[PDB]
Structures are given as C-alpha cells and as structure tokens.
Scaffold this active site. Structure first.
Site, PDB file in Angstrom:
ATOM      1  N   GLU A 115       0.867  -1.157   0.000  1.00 54.73           N
ATOM      2  CA  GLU A 115       0.000   0.000   0.000  1.00 54.73           C
ATOM      3  C   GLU A 115       0.910   1.214   0.000  1.00 54.73           C
ATOM      4  OE1 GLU A 115      -2.676   0.299   3.334  1.00 54.73           O
ATOM      5  OE2 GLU A 115      -2.934   2.463   3.074  1.00 54.73           O
ATOM      6  N   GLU A 120      -2.877  11.852   2.328  1.00 58.56           N
ATOM      7  CA  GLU A 120      -3.631  11.320   3.453  1.00 58.56           C
ATOM      8  C   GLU A 120      -3.446  12.178   4.688  1.00 58.56           C
ATOM      9  OE1 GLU A 120      -2.498   7.469   5.045  1.00 58.56           O
ATOM     10  OE2 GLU A 120      -4.548   7.092   5.736  1.00 58.56           O
TER      11      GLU A 120
END
Ligand SMILES: *[C@@H]1O[C@H](CO)[C@@H](O[C@@H]2O[C@H](CO)[C@@H](O[C@@H]3O[C@H](CO[C@H]4O[C@H](CO[C@H]5O[C@H](CO)[C@@H](O)[C@H](O)[C@@H]5O[C@H]5O[C@H](CO)[C@@H](O)[C@H](O)[C@@H]5O)[C@@H](O)[C@H](O[C@H]5O[C@H](CO)[C@@H](O)[C@H](O)[C@@H]5O)[C@@H]4O)[C@@H](O)[C@H](O)[C@@H]3O)[C@H](O)[C@H]2NC(C)=O)[C@H](O)[C@H]1NC(C)=O
Length: 298
Positions: A115, A120
């Site tokens: 990932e 974010e």
C-alpha cells in the site's frame, strides 16, 4: 526515468475507468460508501468537463442507529506495477472528522501486495503524510534524500502498530485547509522495483516541472528535483512487497485514525467524532475532492 502516457483521466472518463466501491469501510469510519449509480444520482460524484468532484453528503442529519454519512471510494479498474501517477488536485476534503486519501493498494491480498498512501491525513491536520504499508521485512533508513521528515521507519503493518513507514511533507499547504486556500497542487508518485518516491508541488510553485503541470504524454522524473518522500530499497525489497495495485481515492469520517477522541479533540474538534458527523451536515459542504486530472505513465 523516462515514461510515456498510459492513462489520461479527466472528467467523465473516471466513470468508465474507475468503479465505486460500495463496501463496509475497512477503517470502520462513520461512512456509507455508495455505489456509482447512487453517487451520480445524489451528486456525490460529479464528472464532467475538466472536473471530477467526489464529496460527502452535506444535507442529511443522520439517524444515530442508521448508516454513516454518504461518501465515495473510487478504484481504478486497471492495476499498475512500475509506473508514475500524477494527481492534479484543486481541492481536497476538509472539516472535522474528515479522513481523505489518494493511494494505491492490492485489496485482495493486503498487506502483502503493498500500500502506498500519496495524499492522506485527518481532521484538517497538516502536513500531508506519505506512507507505505507492507508485510514483513521492509524498513527504511533513518536518513535518505528527500524534503520531507520521516516518522516511523518500519513499513511492516504487523510489527509497527499498523502505522506503516511514513514521511511528513515539509509545508502546511501540502494538506487540508492550507492546501485548499492555495488552490491545491500536484502530487506525483513514481514506483519502480527499487524505490517509491512522492513529489508535492503547490499550485503556486514557481518550480513545478512542466511534465507534472501540463501533463504531456512523455515525462522524465530525473528533472523533478528531490522528492518529498523517498522510500529506497536499502532495507526493503520494494518490488517483492508490492504487486499490481489499483489507484483509490476516497473520503471516510472518524474511524480507526480520525475518530480517536484524543486525535479528534487534539485537532480542535469538539466532542464525539461520530456525533459531530451525524449532526452537522452543513459542516461537510467543503468535504470534497475537486480533481482536474489523474494521469498514469508507464
Ligand atoms: C452537482 O455538483 C456539481 C459540482 O459541485 C454542481 O456544479 C456546480 O454548479 C454551480 C451552480 O450551477 C456552478 O456555479 C456557477 O459557476 C459559474 C462559473 O463556472 C465556471 O467557472 C468555474 C470556476 O472556474 C475557474 O476556476 C477553475 C479552478 O477552480 C479553473 O479550472 C477555471 O479555468 C476557472 O479559472 C478562471 O478563474 C480563475 C479565478 O477564479 C483564474 O485564476 C483563471 O485564470 C480563470 O480565469 C468552473 O468551476 C466552471 O467549470 C465547470 O463548467 C465547465 C463548463 O462550463 C466545465 O468544463 C468544468 O469541468 C466545470 O464543470 C465554469 O467554467 C458562475 O457563472 C455561476 O455564477 C455559478 O457560480 C459551479 O460552477 C458548478 N461546479 C462545477 C461544475 O464544478 C452541480 O450544480 C450539481 N448538480 C445539480 C445541483 O444538479
């Protein structure tokens, strides 16, 4: 480090090249991820001209015993290994309780397919975080060439408290209300067998590579300057920890990161995250992505 255009996604193109994931939130947020048809009907996704909007419901007051706040999580149909992805982002979601992300993963074998989180954060807290989450035996050196600041250097989700190995961007306008006030900017991520790099360029940057800003069909990352985040292979076989990944762009609320009381309240957000999200629809009017383009090069 020269690549050529593989996918060019602008406006309505996203409706045929991505799907909406109508799934229970893996991060347990106060969210109801709707399907594509529902998103389009309710205008939670708007894809037309040179604009993609992905937004939260900002009108419904939620039944506390009902589902969470309507939002969207879109996923590219195609998967990618060695590639560059460039996100031209005018606006990202803001507001207390928000947890937006633009990232890549292989959901089907997580975390073993890797990932990479490109954009974010939570609860409007700048700066942006860029993070890898992997299986065992993947760490980062304490010092390596990048403009950001490494936080956790063990990428293995099983032994790092599920944080991943992260880098904080050096400027406030990499994220949140600061980013939005500035008109957003560009995020680029290069992944090879040997490394992952992320670059952030603010909208008003005098030094944004034309490669990134104008989206020509040929790019050369050698000319992009020092990356914001660098994940070398010094202590991690990058290629063996990542497989073919989809691009995901989403917005959740509260949940395992943003919803923790200490984190939510520490961000200056009052009371309970879930209660806040239930009862303040209007406070999510600015909880939207406005994306000008996403381009992938191989
Ligand atoms: C479902 O949800 C959608 C999305 O929210 C709703 O759509 C909105 O609907 C409202 C109401 O109808 C629209 O408001 C109107 O906007 C009119 C002006 O629109 C035009 O300009 C907009 C701003 O463009 C500038 O900024 C952007 C960056 O943010 C640049 O890309 C662009 O080039 C413009 O830059 C100029 O200005 C800046 C400074 O501001 C300078 O720096 C630059 O140099 C330039 O001079 C823009 O967003 C609009 O784009 C939309 O439409 C075009 C086609 O016309 C399309 O190509 C785009 O992709 C996009 O769809 C447009 O160009 C204004 O006259 C009016 O008073 C009112 O404010 C709002 O624009 C919509 N937002 C969208 C479409 O993104 C929708 O209503 C909802 N559906 C429902 C209810 O059913």
């Amino acid at each position: 480090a020269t690549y050529h255009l593989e996918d060019n996604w602008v406006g309505s193109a996203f409706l045929s090249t991505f799907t909406h994931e109508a799934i229970a939130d893996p991060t347990h947020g106060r969210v109801n991820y709707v399907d594509q048809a529902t998103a389009l009907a309710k205008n939670l996704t708007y894809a037309s001209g040179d604009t993609l909007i992905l937004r939260a419901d900002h009108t419904t007051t939620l039944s506390p015993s009902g589902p969470g706040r309507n939002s969207v999580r879109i996923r590219s149909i195609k998967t990618y290994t060695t590639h560059v992805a460039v996100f031209d982002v005018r606006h990202m979601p803001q507001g207390c309780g928000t947890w937006p992300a633009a990232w890549e993963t292989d959901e089907g074998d997580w975390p073993n397919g890797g990932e990479v989180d490109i954009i974010e954060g939570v609860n409007d807290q700048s700066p942006n975080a860029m993070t890898l989450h992997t299986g065992a035996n993947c760490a980062m050196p304490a010092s390596r060439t990048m403009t950001g600041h490494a936080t956790n250097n063990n990428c293995d989700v099983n032994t790092d408290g599920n944080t991943g190995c992260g880098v904080q961007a050096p400027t406030a306008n990499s994220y949140g209300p600061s980013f939005n006030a500035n008109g957003g900017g560009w995020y680029a991520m290069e992944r090879t067998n040997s490394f992952i790099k992320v670059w952030f360029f603010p909208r008003n940057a005098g030094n944004v590579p034309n490669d990134i800003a104008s989206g020509p069909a040929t790019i050369n990352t050698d000319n992009w300057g020092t990356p914001t985040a660098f994940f070398p292979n010094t202590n991690c076989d990058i290629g063996s920890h990542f497989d073919a990944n989809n691009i995901i762009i989403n917005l959740t609320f509260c949940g395992d990161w943003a919803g923790q009381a200490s984190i939510f309240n520490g961000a200056g957000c009052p009371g309970s995250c879930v209660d806040y999200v239930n009862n303040n629809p209007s406070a999510f009017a600015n909880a939207y992505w406005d994306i000008a383009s996403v381009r992938v090069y191989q």
